[PDB]
Amino acid sequence: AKTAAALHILVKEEKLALDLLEQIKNGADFGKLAKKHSICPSGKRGGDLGEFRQGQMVPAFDKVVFSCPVLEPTGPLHTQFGYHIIKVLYRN
DSSP, X not given: OOEEEEEEEEESSHHXXXXXXXXXXXXXXXXXXXXXXXXXTTHHHHTTOOEEETTSSOHHHHHHHHHSOTTOOEEEEEETTEEEXXXXXXXX
């Protein structure tokens, strides 16, 4: 699929990623957790890029959106920036 709706959180240290994964299970809040933790110039937008082509931001994203099914929070994944957790939506 060319364009998909995707939310991404990048964690610098694994310990926080584990706390997030458990934190999302205990609480559950992919959008709000991404915005607070990302604290980056793409926290507002990278935490909610809306729909964009499979080749805009990070290649690793194309793999999992083509690996996991949409509507399937997959991650946290491994990427150079740190841990990538990707939520897939619409996929079109």
